[PDB]
């Protein structure tokens, strides 16, 4: 069936069906391709992913409004549990519907874990009608994008190649309009709508023109008295819904958290997205586009060449390399987006931006793991899509003497100095945990090697934490950094950081020390596997010409001692195991340190996280009690769905071990035996396949087994994370 590739269609086996799906959206290798048709097919496809996003969001709104309890949750956000979607499974029994109907709703339901209730409530949504109206809005926006992907593919409305390779115009329009004006409008929403909705005022499309956000109006804005909007901020004794304790401010720099809702002040976030709009609009007017003024991108890169020659030619020749290579542009985007995705995880748990999110313990966990596991998957793609650049879109003669060739020249030094750091952290970190495992075991818990992370405690003292007693500049009243920002942010900031009941700059001990170093083992060795597959993508001593074969090929044969798993695809393949291991350590450390905080017994983590039996005893074995009893022989609770899923992941994980351990040659001889039986059987022989059956290829099995591996790695932990935290409710 593949029309884009005639080589696979002539294949008689089932390899046609499998390879037809995997090479579907790889437009470069297609038959009869052109550089101009490539960009157009991408531009149309990128409209599609938007259509699924806006529809996916519309489905959550509808399924929440129709089946949820958003109206009931706002009145008592703390005690009431949110509801994601209802359940209709006719294979249930009567005990299950009685258990799964825990919500106020009539029938059984699923409790939500995303946190959309806390988000929608904060921006001024207080009814189910307003969600129905919104679900229609995005479904319209979704259909508009589908119409555009088809429209902008037609004979007319078909952009030329020069239009795509206009970088200076894209930056100015995207930095100013997509980022800035969007951030400016969001401030327009928080001011005109949300802050009133917090202070009791109901603002909507009916009355947003008549209602003023501020009593004075815009006359301060023109006069220059811009401090009038920060005069009467909201008091501490302020309920988030009612006008009790309210103020008139719309832009303020209070800092810290709101007392009742342990969250950031809305007036601050309104002030935040305003300043971001100004810098991004200013940055948008930088590059040159159809007018005399402006910078040029190529002129800059050619200029930043150091005179002495530490970088040789420098950044010359790179503009045509980046602008013409799509894989280069994709590697930088993923590496940037994958890092941002980790910031969203690290900066939300410490600085809750939404109302009544700090109290929802189950919701904070999933949001952290969800983004971090995505941050790993994305970041493993940047190197992978960065390795494809060296094979397909790299020209050495054009990029001669520049930074990119000078890196590739001495790659033996990079890969080697990396291997030292992975080995160093690996021996010495494990040796200490094992030194503490043993010496605990012989009854002497005082002989442990507990090293205090002084450098991090030095920061928290330099950022307001008076526990450690270092007495740094911002922990000292006499310093200027305390004097500056004393009227602005410090009274609200110092109160929060010194409070030891929030996740803002938690206390650190020697147990937190070993893990931050064990995390370093993951990043430095995961980078090693991916960096190697990139730099050695063009050639190795074992295979001087990898570039002629491709990114993904099985091997070069048993000759030269063996050539299994050399290709750059096989490096990405091995890194995902380390990506999951690294994120697992990062995520295990978040959950347990927070459980001890929520349970009140912080001493559990500090004393037991120094040796590895504590992780197996106190974290895994202990918190898997309520979960494992989801379906007992006596009865069943509401956590039965999670225990079922908990095994479901312990199984999928094991099925991948087949495709990983057992390789093709055992199976193809086996399928030849079943083929003999199907023909020699008296009646079944009348039936005959249209496509010949063969075993899965080599590269396919590494992919398939990794999917069965990773899915069990995720479905297992998601059940444990939600069940452990939900059953205890703390």
């Amino acid at each position: 069936f593949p029309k884009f590739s005639q080589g696979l269609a002539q294949d008689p086996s089932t390899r046609r069906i499998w390879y037809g799906l995997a090479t579907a959206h790889d437009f470069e290798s297609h038959d009869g391709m052109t550089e101009e048709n490539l960009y157009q097919k991408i531009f149309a496809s990128h409209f599609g992913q938007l259509a699924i996003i806006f529809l996916w969001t519309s489905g959550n709104l509808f399924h929440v409004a129709w089946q949820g309890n958003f109206e009931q949750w706002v009145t008592d956000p703390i005690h009431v549990r949110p509801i994601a979607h209802a359940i209709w499974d006719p294979h249930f029994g009567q005990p299950a519907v009685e258990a799964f109907t825990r919500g106020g709703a009539s029938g059984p339901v699923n409790i939500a874990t995303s946190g959309v209730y806390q988000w929608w409530y904060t921006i001024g949504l207080r009814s189910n009608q307003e969600l129905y109206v919104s679900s229609v809005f995005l479904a319209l926006v979704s259909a508009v994008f589908l119409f555009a992907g088809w429209l902008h593919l037609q004979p007319n409305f078909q952009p030329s190649l020069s239009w795509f390779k206009d970088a200076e115009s894209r930056l100015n329009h995207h930095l100013a309009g997509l980022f800035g004006v969007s951030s400016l409008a969001w401030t327009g929403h928080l001011v005109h709508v949300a802050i009133p909705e917090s202070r009791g005022q109901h603002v909507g499309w009916d009355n947003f023109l008549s209602v003023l956000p501020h009593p004075q109006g815009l006359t301060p804005f023109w006069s220059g008295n811009w401090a009038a909007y920060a005069q009467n901020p909201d008091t501490a004794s302020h309920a988030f819904g009612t006008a009790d304790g309210s103020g008139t401010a719309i832009l303020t720099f209070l800092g810290g958290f709101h007392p009742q809702t342990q969250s950031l002040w809305l007036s601050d976030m309104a002030h935040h997205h305003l300043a971001i709009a100004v810098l991004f609009i200013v940055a948008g007017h930088m590059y040159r586009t159809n007018f005399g003024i402006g910078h040029r991108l190529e002129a800059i890169l050619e200029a930043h060449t150091p005179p002495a020659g530490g970088l040789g030619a420098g950044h010359k020749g790179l503009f045509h390399t980046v602008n013409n290579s799509l894989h280069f542009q994709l590697g930088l985007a993923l590496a940037s987006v994958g890092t941002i995705t980790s910031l969203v995880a690290q900066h939300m748990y410490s600085l809750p931006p939404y109302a009544y999110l700090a109290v929802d313990f189950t919701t904070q966990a999933s949001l952290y793991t969800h983004h971090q596991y995505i941050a790993g998957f994305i970041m493993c793609g940047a190197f992978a899509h960065g390795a494809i650049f060296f094979i397909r879109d790299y020209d050495p003669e054009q990029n001669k003497g520049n930074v990119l060739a000078r890196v590739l020249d001495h790659k033996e030094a990079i890969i080697s100095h990396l291997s030292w750091v992975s080995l160093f952290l690996g021996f010495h970190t494990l040796g200490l945990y094992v030194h503490n495992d043993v010496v605990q075991a012989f009854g002497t818990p005082e002989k442990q090697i507990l090293i205090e992370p002084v450098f991090a405690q030095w920061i928290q003292a330099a950022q307001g934490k008076s526990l450690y007693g270092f007495d740094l500049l911002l922990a000292s009243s006499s310093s200027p950094a305390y004097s500056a920002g004393q009227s602005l942010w410090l009274p609200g900031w110092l109160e929060a950081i010194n409070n030891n009941q929030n996740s803002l700059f938690l206390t650190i001990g020697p147990g937190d020390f070993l893990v931050h170093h064990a995390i370093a083992l993951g990043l430095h060795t995961t980078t090693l596997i991916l960096v190697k597959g990139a730099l050695d993508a063009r050639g190795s001593k074992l295979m001087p010409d990898k570039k002629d074969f491709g990114y993904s090929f099985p091997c070069d044969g048993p000759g030269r001692g063996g050539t299994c798993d050399i290709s750059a695809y096989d490096a990405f393949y091995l890194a995902v195991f380390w990506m999951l291991n690294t994120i697992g350590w990062v995520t295990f450390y978040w959950h347990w340190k927070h459980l001890t905080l929520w349970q009140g017994n912080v001493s559990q983590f500090d004393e037991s996280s120094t040796y590895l039996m504590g992780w197996l005893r106190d974290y895994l074995w202990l918190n898997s009690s309520q979960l494992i009893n989801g379906y007992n022989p006596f009865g069943m609770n509401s956590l039965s769905v999670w225990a079922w899923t908990f095994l479901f992941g312990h199984l999928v994980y094991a099925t991948g071990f087949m495709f990983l351990i057992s390789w093709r040659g055992y199976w193809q001889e086996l399928i030849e035996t079943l083929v003999w039986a199907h023909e020699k059987t008296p009646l079944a022989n009348l039936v005959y396949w249209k496509d010949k059956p063969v075993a899965l290829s080599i590269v396919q099995a590494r992919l398939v087994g990794l999917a069965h591996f990773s899915v069990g790695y995720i479905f297992t932990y998601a059940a444990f994370l939600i069940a452990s935290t939900a059953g205890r409710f703390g």
Binding site: A441, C555, D556, G561, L574, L612, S625, I661
Partner: protein, 105 residues
């Protein structure tokens, strides 16, 4: 639940008693098991290239072996896997059982 989670209480709580050796072997048996997965899942090709970048540094300092370093053969990596695999899988029971049963119930 009733076999693994339950009967593992005697092994896990063995620290500070005469059965402490079984608590350590219970863990070390897991390490050697997982350690085998590097050999079964991977292949000789990635490792022989990595050694080349390591030989460069050992060569740069004029400290290199006349016996050239070579990655393990294919059949050896498979044998090394099942060995460290079975050893870690079997030694775990050997610790899970004797600690459970010596501390009767």
């Amino acid at each position: 639940r009733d076999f693994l989670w339950a009967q593992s209480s005697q092994v896990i709580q063995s620290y500070g008693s005469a059965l402490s050796a079984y608590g350590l072997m219970f863990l070390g048996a897991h390490f050697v098991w997982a350690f085998s997965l590097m050999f079964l899942f991977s292949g000789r090709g990635y490792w022989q290239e990595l050694i080349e970048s390591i030989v460069w540094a050992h060569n740069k300092l004029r400290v290199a072996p006349s016996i050239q370093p070579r990655a393990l053969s294919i059949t050896q990596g498979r044998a090394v896997g099942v060995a460290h695999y079975l050893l870690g899988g079997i030694a775990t029971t050997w610790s899970f059982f004797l600690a459970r049963i010596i501390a009767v119930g």
